[PDB]
């Protein structure tokens, strides 16, 4: 599992529902999805950074080529941060 990200191993569909259920478990309010940064909105190669927020402050943000994909992948990023299986985590101790 070295070099493999979470959802290249545990494949899921609709991470937004799993995320809102998880924050329901943590007794945190449902996230607000806000379009933080965007470039080339009307062209064939856009970019959108969508940030998931919880009570005035963001839990995560993620990029994408459209707002739906960006929201979905930001949901995946927030699931990674909540589960602690981040790209920044401590490596395995052998």
């Amino acid at each position: 599992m070295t070099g493999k990200e979470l959802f290249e191993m545990w494949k899921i569909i609709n991470p937004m529902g799993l995320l809102v259920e998880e924050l329901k478990k943590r007794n945190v309010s449902a996230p607000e999805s806000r379009l933080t940064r965007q470039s080339g909105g009307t062209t064939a190669l856009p970019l959108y950074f969508v940030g998931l927020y919880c009570d005035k402050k963001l839990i995560a943000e993620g990029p994408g080529e459209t707002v739906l994909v960006a929201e979905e992948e930001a949901a995946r990023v927030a699931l990674r941060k909540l589960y602690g299986f981040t790209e920044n985590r401590r490596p395995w101790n052998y």
């Binding site: 080339g40 909105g41 062209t43 970019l47 993620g62 990029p63 994408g64 992948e73 990023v77 790209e87």
Partner: protein
């Protein structure tokens, strides 16, 4: 960090749209900023094969300003292939027949002289007035700072500025002006 592979690559290699004011600026400094942005040389990811250039929208390009007498002294030359078709026109005549061509030729000069120059030049959009089409105004991100410090006239001086400036000398009491 912690993105998936395809969105992380898409975020790294996406191209951005930069607005560039062009009033009271020289065409050369605008061309420097524009060509640095068009080659992708303003990006740490840069490589000449990767084609990581950006879009530059230089507006108000009919109010550029050559430093010096260049408006009567810089000449743009071309030659239609037919015998006797050598056309030399000053910067004034070229700025009157087409008020876009000066900055375009400057940028075309500053770009590297390879086959990517035409695609880089097609990424760039020039507009002569304050008017920009709506389909481009929906894509801009950063308004680049103007390289030349714009000077200001007597009219744009406030009272406090000329009062804070001390006035220097005795005029003779009897002088006609």
């Amino acid at each position: 960090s912690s993105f998936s592979r395809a969105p992380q690559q898409w975020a790294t290699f996406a191209r951005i749209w930069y607005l560039l004011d062009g009033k009271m600026q020289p065409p050369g400094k605008l061309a420097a900023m524009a060509s640095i942005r068009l080659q992708g040389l303003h990006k740490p990811v840069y490589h000449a094969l990767s084609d990581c250039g950006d879009h530059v929208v230089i507006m108000n390009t009919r109010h550029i300003a050559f430093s010096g007498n260049k408006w009567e002294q810089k000449v743009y030359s071309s030659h239609t292939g037919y015998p006797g078709g050598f056309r030399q026109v000053t910067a004034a005549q070229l700025h009157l027949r087409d008020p876009v061509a000066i900055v375009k030729l400057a940028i075309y000069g500053m770009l590297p002289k390879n086959l990517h120059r035409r695609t880089m030049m097609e990424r760039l959009h020039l507009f002569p007035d304050e008017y920009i089409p709506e389909d481009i105004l929906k894509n801009l991100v950063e308004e680049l700072p103007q390289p030349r410090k714009i000077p200001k006239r007597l009219d744009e001086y406030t009272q406090e500025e000329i009062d804070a400036f001390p006035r220097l000398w005795t005029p003779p009491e009897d002088y006609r002006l």
